[PDB]
């Protein structure tokens, strides 16, 4: 109960939104026979709606004055209270994949640059080396840290094109 947001399990507007969605979904149910395939699809949609409302509740999620769940972004506050699953763990979850793509792109760029006419390698990809680097990029932050200390990651600006101001 932070920032004046009630939990989703004990919110009246959350349940009123659930009842409203169940009402409109059951409105379309009266136009089809129960043994039809649109009825089965509508029943599966209603089951997915009920499962989503149940799983969104009782998970630490909270909402305020709207019936729509809110996300807590401050670290520590999302760690002392059970809210790290909203954005805190997705932050490291995205950064792992984001650093994965950046690392395999860097290794492919470095590997292709030590080859005759490297401009062709960007439009003519090679599969075995790219796929080998794709499956050799799980430890991207471990390769990134070791290259940072020793200068292989970076480059001094004496061989870097700089503006003539």
């Amino acid at each position: 109960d932070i920032a004046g947001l009630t939990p989703c399990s004990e919110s009246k507007a959350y349940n009123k939104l659930e009842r409203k969605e169940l009402k409109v979904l059951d409105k379309r149910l009266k136009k089809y026979e129960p043994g039809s395939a649109p009825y089965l699809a509508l029943q599966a949609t209603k089951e997915r709606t009920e499962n989503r409302f149940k799983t969104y509740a009782k998970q630490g999620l909270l909402c305020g004055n709207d019936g729509l769940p809110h996300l807590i972004s401050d670290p520590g506050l999302a760690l002392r209270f059970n809210h790290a699953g909203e954005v805190f763990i997705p932050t490291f979850g995205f950064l792992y994949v984001a650093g994965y793509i950046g690392h395999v792109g860097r290794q492919y760029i470095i590997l292709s640059k030590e080859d005759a006419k490297p401009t062709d390698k960007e439009i003519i990809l090679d599969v075995p080396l790219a796929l080998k680097l794709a499956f050799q990029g799980w430890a991207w932050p471990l390769a990134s840290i070791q290259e940072l200390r020793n200068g292989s990651l970076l480059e001094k600006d004496e061989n870097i094109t700089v503006s003539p101001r």
Partner: protein, 107 residues
Amino acid sequence: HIKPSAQVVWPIVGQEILNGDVGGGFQGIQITSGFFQLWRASGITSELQLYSTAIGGLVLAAACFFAGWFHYHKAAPKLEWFQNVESMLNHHLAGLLGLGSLAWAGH
């Protein structure tokens, strides 16, 4: 009383709301091309006939692609063949347009 519909979406991510209640115990995207009106003008009753038309169209599409491959890579016409403007006009006036119009009138 039944709105036409010929595109059915998947239930993957919230798209089940797009399968609108078009009537006739069917749900899908309400189409706007008017293909149902054309299939009522050109007398078409069952879905078997539409299946046959689709398979024939696929066969003619494969034939057209093979024709392009043949008429370029295998047997390419010369410039004098393309410069026969009178034959082109006669064959695409009497042949293409006229033969298609007569075939459609007969159908």
